[PDB]
């Protein structure tokens, strides 16, 4: 053409991501991009070597690159320069070479909140985490303007803006960066001490459904992704599925106490630590007991004890509690490759399946699901939807366990942490803590799920440590992060004289 009127897209500024207190976690930064018009470049060959050497390119590869594209009006030269190397190259004044400021993401907290926030691709689109999950909200609407272009396809005139670029909107996460630092650090120190390869730690507000901290090791620096490894990029807390084992026994007990047939002081004979059912044998981790009360069944994590209770009340009651607290269910968070795990259902529950569900081998969950289930028990039996964004108006949420049963089970989990023979390494200096260890098979994962303070719960937490060198590995991690979380949140002690 003698001349052509053309569309040009005006990029939108991507919305700021903050923590719940407004601390920046992802910010769109002006970067210097140099681009070129080959058609203009072909008229200034004597400038190429100087241009090549400025971009640190082999003269010949650069010349071959221009010649092989002599028919196009655009090629990137280099993206993500400081203003200085922009002006260092524009200083040359090569025909067909231009500087533009593009927006690129910077992650001020880096590796500390990598998995939760995620990262954008080269086109400034979300690739992982919140960046992908809220991409529409954050992206805004690119703009449009009419330009006039010559034979060589260069902008000779700005005609009009036809649509204004709409800025992306700010997003406050539920994450408290201070709790997230404490969690990242304590988990890192736990893997080292315990000789473990990987791990996750989730902290939830039991009243609001807010995820206050979500940390995975190993982690990566999202500002430097050249030496990428899918191992480091793995959001384990939302992706890793495991059999929760003893950590779901409190939901089996919740069904027992709601049945009308069981109270805490009731007794089960678990001698001799094994129970044959058809061809299958249920086996306890410790086999030194006869009569146990329901609290003792939790303290000893007796698979025999919880099996005999499950046979008495039926698997249907247990399945229903686990379903209602979200185990094996969609979290509704919309994070990419979030797994739902599996809470298998039956019309007919034989003894074998009934027992395996009750002691937590008949299902697979994520750390986030387990944390959400502990939040509902901790919130006196009321489930609140999970949120990764700051909650200002709390949803109504659902009464899934009766407050009386939830209170009784809280008191049981407090005695699991506090009673002689209990998980004493979970005790939280300040406050009555409540929780339960488990081991999930792989080699295995050490689990601890709990909440505090035990009387007036505020925070639920799950700690997963994969293949240490079982559950008395995770207990101390919970102790440290919980004390630290309750203090950063100015929660007051409930263990006083």
Curated annotation (Swiss-Prot):
EC class of the enzyme, as a word: hydrolase
Signals that turn on the gene: Mainly produced during exponential phase of growth.
Organism in which the protein naturally occurs: Pseudomonas aeruginosa (strain ATCC 15692 / DSM 22644 / CIP 104116 / JCM 14847 / LMG 12228 / 1C / PRS 101 / PAO1)
Gene Ontology MF, one: serine-type D-Ala-D-Ala carboxypeptidase activity
Location of this chain's protein in the cell: Cell inner membrane
GO BP field: cell wall organization; division septum assembly; FtsZ-dependent cytokinesis; peptidoglycan biosynthetic process; proteolysis; regulation of cell shape
Superkingdom of origin organism: Bacteria
Protein name as annotated: Peptidoglycan D,D-transpeptidase FtsI
Topology in membrane: Single-pass membrane protein
Keyword terms: Carboxypeptidase, Cell cycle, Cell division, Cell inner membrane, Cell membrane, Cell shape, Cell wall biogenesis/degradation, Hydrolase, Membrane, Peptidoglycan synthesis, Protease, Septation, Transmembrane, Transmembrane helix
Pathway in which this enzyme or protein is active: Cell wall biogenesis; peptidoglycan biosynthesis
Primary site of residence: membrane
SUPFAM superfamilies: beta-lactamase/transpeptidase-like (SSF56601), Penicillin binding protein dimerisation domain (SSF56519)
Function of the molecule: Catalyzes cross-linking of the peptidoglycan cell wall at the division septum. Binds penicillin.
